[PDB]
Design a binder for this molecule. Sequence first.
Ligand code: SF4
Ligand code: SF4
Ligand code: SF4
Lengths: 96, 55, 264, 318, 53, 155, 176, 70
Amino acid sequence: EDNKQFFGRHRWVIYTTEMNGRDTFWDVDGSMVPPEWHRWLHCMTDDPPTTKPPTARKYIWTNHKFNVSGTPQQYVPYSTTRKKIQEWVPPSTPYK
Amino acid sequence: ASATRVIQLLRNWASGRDLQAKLQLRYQEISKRTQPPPKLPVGPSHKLSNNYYCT
Amino acid sequence: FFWMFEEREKMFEFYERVSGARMHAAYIRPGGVHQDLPLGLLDDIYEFSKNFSFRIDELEEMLTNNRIWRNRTVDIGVVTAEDALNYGFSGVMLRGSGIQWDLRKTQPYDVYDQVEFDVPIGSRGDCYDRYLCRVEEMRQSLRIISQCLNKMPPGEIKVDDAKVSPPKRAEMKTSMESLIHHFKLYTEGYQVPPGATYTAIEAPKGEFGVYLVSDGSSRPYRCKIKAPGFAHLAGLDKMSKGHMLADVVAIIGTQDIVFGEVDR
Amino acid sequence: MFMINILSLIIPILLAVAFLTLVERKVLGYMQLRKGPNVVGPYGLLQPIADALKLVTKEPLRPGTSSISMFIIAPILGLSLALTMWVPLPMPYPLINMNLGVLFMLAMSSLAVYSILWSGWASNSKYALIGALRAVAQTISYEVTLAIILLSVLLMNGSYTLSTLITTQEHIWMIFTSWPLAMMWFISTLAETNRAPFDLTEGESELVSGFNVEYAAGPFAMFFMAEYANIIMMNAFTAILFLGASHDPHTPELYTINFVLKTLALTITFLWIRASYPRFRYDQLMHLLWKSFLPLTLALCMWHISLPIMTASIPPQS
Amino acid sequence: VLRLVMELSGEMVRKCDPHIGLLHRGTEKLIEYKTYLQALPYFDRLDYVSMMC
Amino acid sequence: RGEYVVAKLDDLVNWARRSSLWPMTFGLACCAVEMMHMAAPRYDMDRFGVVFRASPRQSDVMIVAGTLTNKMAPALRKVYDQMPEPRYVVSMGSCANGGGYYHYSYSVVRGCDRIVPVDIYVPGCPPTAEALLYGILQLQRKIKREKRLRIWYRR
Amino acid sequence: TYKFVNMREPSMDMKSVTDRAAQTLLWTELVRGLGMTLSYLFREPATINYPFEKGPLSPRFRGEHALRRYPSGEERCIACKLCEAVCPAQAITIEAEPRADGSRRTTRYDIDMTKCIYCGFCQEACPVDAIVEGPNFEFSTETHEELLYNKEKLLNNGDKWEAEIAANIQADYLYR
Amino acid sequence: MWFEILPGIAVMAACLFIPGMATAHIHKFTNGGKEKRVAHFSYQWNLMERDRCISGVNRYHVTKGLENID
Ligand code: SF4
Ligand code: SF4
Ligand code: SF4
């Protein structure tokens, strides 16, 4: 961060050379910004997470994930409901 | 995204104005992004008496 | 294009900071605006308004007195003042020709009457006069912005009547009446008394109107959109009657026809 | 080593044209508050390479409603004439000392119509057929003004030997004697290269492109190469013609540096003009030269032919 | 989105014929199925340069 | 063996394609205005080698920006069918991706995919300029992972 | 009140006509614009280095929907279906059920992102602040099915962008 | 930040630089250090031909002074 620049270039990120397997040295997108730093990046606040510890809780992820679309770790939609009208099971005893 | 005085005088003369008074940029003068919690006011019909909805 | 589009992005920042989206606000709802502005928004608006005129004139100097901006545009496609109003033309299209008419002054909706401002009235009714009217409208817009910025009163943001506007979240989670009112308002909504209205305002394109007719239930019966560009395109044939193709594309410019509202 | 000198003429002009496609996208952007290409290599230095590779390996579509002969010949004409029209330029020692170099190059300047017409008609599209005739009329109607301006300027030089032009200027910049003329000449140059103020052929509302519509990939890029080689060539022509420079025979490099600086400055003025001005209309475009430019050019030519006689200052013939 | 079927003796345009409908969404049909509170964003997406107007 | 040479060569080719994709604008609604903001000074699309302006003959990517109506569909189809290979089409905005606000209309197709193949689905109503730009960068990384000549050599 | 825009007719003295003739012949306003654009060339270029630097935002920013949960870990959604009755695009679908514990959670809660128009109506409709729109906008996908979210995907979104949403709500609940 | 353009035209300058001395040097290289003797008129051509004949090496730019004659 440089406090003298314009409001929109006063803070910036040098991304990691490696994040969860992929070697993002020469190519990188804006999806490896952990949420705690995401607000500080987008000027949602003037408090870095070091000075502003996010309220920790059990269900929060311990590892940020970039958009997994494309790679076989992507999300596929599927019905999250139980079954509708259920079929009648045929008997196993003989016809007679 | 300020500049050199040599360039500063060149752009002003070419632009025929004193643009340093206000640039298209926006420096520290912007409003802070961590404003204190605002206590919002209420409306007229917030009393607990003579607030009959009929009238 | 780009010089003023940076300022347009600065506008989009305010749009984002008030409603939540930089373009499609969903801000102004029936019974007043949705919620109050964030703290410090007024100061940033003040700085932008201070800085804007020095680029408005900057655009002017590039276009106003330029030889080829005028020559391509001056006195091409004249529109007669009499023939303008019969054609259903509105907004700057009227003001470019010369009729002194503006809904902001003659039929002042909301608090536009208390705001002092002059309108730019055209001289020759041509393309160039309309362009100059748009720029002078920029400047009078800046003056209006100053006036409203200086005199905003203290008060609520939505109508105090909860039956038409959602209650504040505090009484939502504490008071029975607010809970039921919010539940029905976001479930059913405010049932509107039966009736038909034609509400018209001075949209920047032109006069924009809604013919809203409601049967008397939680849902409307028919809303019709009077968009300023529809009558404009209807008259666009008489608009150009001998000018070149470069002229018709210079015409559809101050014709300022976005194809999102004419087309509905 | 003659052919080596030839290749040392073509190839560097090709890199110059290639990096002009970067300097324009940077200059324009900086003129309109844009950083320009700086992602492909340092400061976007590698960007012209990538687009060139893409256009080489882009599919060149054959126009189905076309005769391929002209669809291939027109890029040949446009590109080859543009490069061979660099041949007689007075670098401190010009490559080919053609006794009529200025007339040689003016005559070849008219040949761009012979790529424009075949491109516009052979591709067989409405935009193409319109823009072919419109651009042809543009360039031919400005070629005349170029001609009288060249003649009137040369009447003080002495001959059509374009190497002696330096000897003409030597003391003072020639513009100081023909600034009214050069002001027309430069603008007519702007008209002949089809640039944003005077292009009229692209017209991305009613002509879209005009001539390079159906051209794709390679033959399409060849016309761009011709177009942005004529920029450098005519800016260099104007540079020597009016913006003279020193040339010590024992140090040829000095005039080379001065001349390339002049060419870069004039090309930057080209980009400068296009980044600001609106675009002419065909009506006004030909009104500008028929109604206004041509009478002034005729009168100035009369002035500049009468002047050497009355001053007893006719230029040396040899 | 736009269509101008133009009739011209070459340059002076004789008679134009614009063809709107090239971005036709049934919004006017769409309103009378949602409540007014739900009907609001249609106007936001209607003239998308003058949203708040 | 041949994988080394063919991989280096096709890596060169796909890099050249990746850094010089030319959008075919094609803005139909407010998504067009947001894209125009994305080419404004602030984000400056033109920096990345993208050129925004491109005739459909000389272009690499189509951004379907806005709602696509029934009357439009034949025109968009003829535009894409003429688009030279390679041709990756990105759909911006909920309307173009599928349906939209006007999903259950009578003259609006329920997605650009039903008309034309979509390479990158960009969500947003409108997708804020930088989200569009990120979709463009995702397409760039897609072009990076391109193995044309590898598959040719290993067919 | 009103102002006439173009009635400033010119005078006709020798000085004025000489000035106008000079401006027409010796191109001046042309040079005026040509020099203004030069001033803009030497200025500081407005350009943000994406993705290294992102555009400024606000705590109210509407983006990817997500399902939050109480501090105890229990999901806040009680499946009142208010958000489904509110969404103008009808992109939300819920099926409810009496859970094994009993609390009426959603068997199915899917938001069709391609139908969604990103209005923020669902969050303001929610009486328990269960559904919300996170600050994320970086979810441009490749397949149409990737966009069609599920209940599990919404829960994962609420568990990834959670410190963000908690901080933004803490800074915005007073306004709303 | 106009200096970002400075690399962009710099190579461009170099691109136009090379045709300058390359033609200039090669001439100096070919004509025995002397620059090329331009023959714009038939008298110049006759002088060049007589110089070539006198040289005896079929190279015009080779020149011999009074030491060549008695
Ligand atoms: S997705 Fe939203 S912004 Fe895009 S065209 Fe549809 S309504 Fe407009
Ligand atoms: S923003 Fe949320 S509630 Fe509104 S339409 Fe989209 S998904 Fe539905
Ligand atoms: S409004 Fe909130 S609590 Fe009700 S169903 Fe929707 S997400 Fe669940």
